[PDB]
Amino acid sequence: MTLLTLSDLLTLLRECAGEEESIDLGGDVEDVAFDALGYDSLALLNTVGRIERDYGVQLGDDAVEKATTPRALIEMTNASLTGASPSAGGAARDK
């Protein structure tokens, strides 16, 4: 599917919180922790849910844990989209 952007994660977050602007904080909140901008987790949990379903991402369930900033979630998503789904692996020990 299509990767993700800051404007995306922001709006979906905005919809979750119920704000009237994808980026109400202003803009200087791309590298600020969710708790540092005003997000708790419950809202993020919902937003992340819509993303995993809307984008169909699934690199790691713990991605939400490490995800402290928006660039994190977006990174995990963009990484999933760019990854183009997994494939187990393919070591080199045959012919």
Curated annotation (Swiss-Prot):
Q: What does the UniProt record tell us about how this protein is modified after translation? A: 4'-phosphopantetheine is transferred from CoA to a specific serine of the apo-ACP-like protein.
Q: Where is the Carrier domain?
A: 3-81
Record-linked PROSITE patterns: CARRIER (PS50075), PHOSPHOPANTETHEINE (PS00012)
Protein's UniProt name: Oxytetracycline polyketide synthase acyl carrier protein
Give the Gene3D superfamilies listed for this entry. Answer: ACP-like
InterPro entries referenced in this protein's UniProt entry, alphabetically: ACP-like_sf, PP-bd_ACP, Ppantetheine_attach_site
Q: Which SUPFAM superfamilies match?
A: ACP-like
- Record's keyword annotation contains tRNA processing: no
